[PDB]
A = this chain, B = another copy of it.
């Protein structure tokens, strides 16, 4: 299951592969300060019964390399998605699913490489742009409160600031306490300098979204406190072939809040390509 490839700058990239090698590739791109573990074991098992699941550790995250520079270069991010697809020999049919920051990683890839390797995109609580005035980068109250404390090298300041997200990634944590802990833990294992580097950039992919020639599922919680639901509304409006699924009452982690509904909606989208 564990694999390694290399980015265009020589950075090692770790990812995991499960499911039938002959099935459709479903590439999972996680959020800021997370890892390939963020999806629950239950959701990965359900997806692996139907697709060839490729769960990447972003550069600076999980077991991937953490270089000093390059996090602000859309071409470097594109190169990372390309390297994983190339390593798995995925040249067509892929579905790229991006949670949170993972939406921006997908859009960097599509902006450099186009859509020839992909049949579909799923944006989960995603940003698709980043910077001042970007509707597709619109952050919620919890992310606004965590900056810049969550980027601190001083541990008490970072723990307090990351801890300020509360139950945003899980929803009500009843029966999910191990997931709650693991998602908080992954944020703290991400180097502060990486947390900072991912946000010290600007990029607009509004015109990329308007140009997409593949179907996109926009899945977003209406009470997302991390990436405002307006960011998902923005992407659904610009993408020519978007299907929106706005989960009433859900915060930032739909795959944790309702793993059954997440797998059903992602599966119905993918199965209908």
Contact = CB atoms under 8 A, between A and B. Distances in A.
A182 interface: yes
Contact of A188 (B12, B16, B158, B185): B185
Q: What is the count of identical protomers in the complex?
A: 2
Interface string A152-176: 1111001100010000000001000
B188 A192 contact: no
Interface residues of A, number: 32
Nearest to A189: B185
Nearest to A193: B178
A19 to B, nearest CB: 16
A14 interface: yes
Contacts of A187: 185
Contacts of A37: 189
Interface string A167-208: 000000100011011101111111111000000000000000
Contact of A177 (B3, B16, B155, B178): B155
A63 interface: yes
A273 interface: no
Nearest to A167: B155
Contacts of A154: 177
Contact of A178 (B14, B16, B159, B191): B191
14 contacts: A1-B12, A2-B63, A63-B63, A154-B177, A155-B173, A155-B177, A178-B191, A181-B188, A181-B189, A181-B192, A182-B189, A185-B189, A186-B189, A189-B189
Question: Which 6 residue pairs spanning A and B have beta carbons closest together?
Answer: A185-B188, A153-B177, A185-B189, A155-B180, A185-B185, A181-B188
